[model samples]
Target chain A: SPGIWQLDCTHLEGKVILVAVHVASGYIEAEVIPAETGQETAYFLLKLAGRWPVKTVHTDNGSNFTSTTVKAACWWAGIKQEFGQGVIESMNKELKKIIGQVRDQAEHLKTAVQMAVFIHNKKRKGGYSAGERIVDIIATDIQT
Target chain B: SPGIWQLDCTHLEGKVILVAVHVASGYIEAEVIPAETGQETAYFLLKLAGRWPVKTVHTDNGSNFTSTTVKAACWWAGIKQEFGQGVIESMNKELKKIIGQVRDQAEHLKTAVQMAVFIHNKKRKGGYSAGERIVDIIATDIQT
Candidate 1:
C-alpha cells in the first residue's frame, strides 16, 4: 500500500489518500484521510479485512502500516504482511497522473482519486475489460 | 523507502518522516516532512542525492515518490527508480519498533527516529562494526 497527497496543499495540510490494490485482479481500494495517521491507516485495514478474506498485505514501510495497532490487527486477522515496491509504484504513478489533471482543490482531490481508482479498475487490458467490476473478475477466478 | 510518523499528533497534524537505506552498506537517510507533499519528498531525495551517488532508488507507490517533480529529479540526476516492498518494510518495521518505545511527543519522536537510524547503522551485523560510520563501510567496500 502507498499513500497520496494533494499537490496543492501547503505546509502538509491537505487531503491524503491511501490506496491498495489486489495484484492479480487490479481491484483498487482508496480512501481520503482528513488527516494522515496510523489510526486512520489501521481503520482502512480493518475495513478491508471485513470486506475481503485478506491472507496477505504488502505495503511501504510507513508508520501507519508498521505501527503496533496495524500489526496486531493483521496478526489477529491471520494476515501476513509483505513488502513490495514495484506494484505500488505503478499504482501511485497512475493515480498521480490522473489526479494531477484535476483542479487542486481538496474536494477535487478526493473525487479525482476515487474516480481514478474506478476508471483504473474498469480499464481494459489484454483484450478484456475484467467484466466491468473487480468483484466480477474475482468471482470468475480471473483474479484470485 | 519507508515512512515514519509521530504517533502523538492528531490524525492530520503529525510530522511525517521518510527514510531510505542502502542495502549492501546499510547506509540510511531520513528526513522530517512539514507537510506530506511531493515537494518535501523531493527535497529529501535531493538531499540524499547530494550525499550519495545514487544509481537507483527503490520506493513504494506513494505519490511523493511517483510525482513528476521527484521523477524528473531522479532522471536529471541519472538515477533509476525501482519499487520493492521488502527492504523498506524491514527498515520501517525496525524503525517503528524502536521509535515506538519512546514517548510519543513530537520532539521525542524526532530524536527517537534519528537515534534509531544511528544505532541501526552502527549496530553490528555479521562480523564487522562498519567502524561506527556508514562512510567507513562505503570506503572499505565492506558492504559492496
Candidate 2:
C-alpha cells in the first residue's frame, strides 16, 4: 500500500498530513487534511492523477479508504483497489527515517516533507541517481 | 534509494531479472534481462522510464551499477544515484518469500515473477492491500 505519512508535528499535532508514494519510482506527494477521511484520501489520490498513471491502488482497511464515496470514485476512474497493512508500515518507517525530527508548525512540517521528498528523489544508490535513470528511460522511450 | 530486484532464475542461470520497487506504494516493475551490465541497467531503467517516475535509485556496489555508461546515463538524466546493499536485499528476501519455489525455465520464471509481483502488489499487511490504497489515492487525485 502507498503508505500515508502521519505527520507528528509538535504544533500541528491534531492536524494530519497525508503522503502518497509511488512505490515503483519512490516519487512522493502529500496533503494537509483536518482528518483521515475518505474525502481526504480521495483528494490526495486525485491530486496524483494529474501527474501519473494509476492502474491500481492498495491500502489498509481504513474507513477513509473503504468508504462509499472513495469506492465510487475509484470505480469511476476504472482503477482496481485492494487493502493491506505492512506495505504502509514500511513506508511510514521510511518516511520517519527521512524526516528525522518533526517540527512544530504545519508549514514547517510541509517544508520538511518537501525537503525529504526532494532528498529521497535525489538519493543515489549503487552510484545511480533515480532521477537520472528515470530521465534516461523516458528519453530513450521517446527516441524509440 | 529505491531497491531493485535481481532475479536469479534457474532455467536462465546466467541471466538476471531486474525488478524495481517503489518503496512508497509497493508498486513494482520487472524485466528479464541478460547478465547485469551498465548498458543493461541503463536499458532497464529506460524501459521503466515510460511507465513510472524514477527519482532515486538504490543498488549494491555491483560492477554493473558502477559502470561508466550507467553513471553517464544517470548523470545525463539528472538523477541522484547512490550505493546500498541492505534495501535491495530486503526486497529480494520478500520476493523470495512470496515466490516460494524457484522454477527451472525462462517462461516459468517469468510466470513466477509476475505472480510474485501481483501478490506483492496485492499483499495485505495488518489487513490493508497496497493496490487498493494506491487506487484510492489515484482515484481521489483524479476527482480533485
Candidate 3:
C-alpha cells in the first residue's frame, strides 16, 4: 500500500539529509536537501510523491513539515499531513523490535541476518522478512 | 557592539517565519522564506548582511544553517557559525527576565513599556532601553 510515510531531516557531517519512511513496510527513501526551509522541504516531498503516490506524510510539528509551503504542496498533491496520532513512530518502534530479533538470529543464519534486510523489509509494501528484505536491497550487483 | 544573535524559525498562522535576535540589544529581524533550503537560508543571511554588515550567524545546529551549502556561504561571507558554548542561549534567558520586568514596569510606564521596543533594541547595534528601542520599530509614523 502507498501507506503513511514519516518525513524528517537530520544533519550529517555538515550536510542536511531529508528522509521519508513508510509506516507499514518500513521502506525509506532519502536524499540531500540544501536547506530545511518549508519551500525546499515541500519540494522534496513532492519529488518523493512523484516517484510513488503517497497517502499521508506523518511528521512531527516543525516549520519544515508544518509550514504553509508544505501544507500547500500537500493540498496540491492529494497527500494528507498528519500529526499527534503518528502511526509511523509506532512502526519505527516495531522495526526496532524486529531488528533486535534479527540481530539475535544472525548467528544462526551465518551471513544472512544483516541490519539492512529488516529496514528493506520495512521499505517493501508486501511485508518481507529481515533476510528477504535485505536481499532485495542487495540488487544491481553481479554474482561474486 | 556587534553582538551575537539567536536564529530560529516558527509557524505563525501557517506561515514559516525565520527570525534573528541580537542577544544584547534584544532586537529582532524576521522575514519569510519560500523554501528552507541551505542555499536560501544562506541567501537570507547575506541579505541581512547587505542591510547591515553581520559579524556572525549564531544559529543552532540544523541543515538550513549547518549544511555544506550554508557553511560555504558563511565562509564566503566571513560569518562564523558556532555551536556549543552558545552565548545567545544565555542572552535569551536574560531577555526573558527583562521582558518580565517590562511587563511589570508597564503599569508604571503607562503606555511606555511596549514589547516591540525591547526586540527592536536587540536589532540595533546601540544599546537602548525598552521604551527607546521599540519606538524605533514604530518607525516612519507621524505622532497622532
C-alpha DockQ of every model: 0.01, 0.02, 0.01
In angstroms, give how far residue B98 of model 3 lies from its true place: 58
Q: For candidate 3 chain B, which ten residues in a row score worst on lDDT?
A: B135-144
Residue A111 in model 1: lDDT: 45
> Which stretches in model 3 have alpha-carbon errors above 4 Å?
A84-144, B1-144
- Count backbone clashes in candidate 1: 10
lDDT of 3 by residue, A53-138 (tens): 36787766455666876776576566886553354565445544544555553332211122322244334345443222222222
TM-score, predicted candidate 1 vs. hidden true structure? 0.40
User: TM-score, each model?
Assistant: 0.40, 0.40, 0.33
Task: Show pairs that collide, candidate 1.
Answer: A1-A59, A12-B35, A83-B85, A84-B84, A84-B85, A85-B83, A85-B84, A85-B85, A86-B83, A88-B61
Local distance difference test, each candidate: 0.50, 0.49, 0.48
Better of 2 and 3 by TM-score: 2
Please rank every candidate by DockQ, starting with the best: 2, 1, 3
Instruction: Please report how far candidate 2 places residue B113 from its true position, in Å.
Output: 1.3
* Cα lDDT tens digits for candidate 1, B59-144: 55444466876675566445666543354456667766756654352244544555455445545677543213233333333213
Put down candidate 1 lDDT per residue, A23-133, tens digits, no spaces: 554556676667666655655565455333466776554445667766755664456765434545666677667666543522445544644554455467774432133
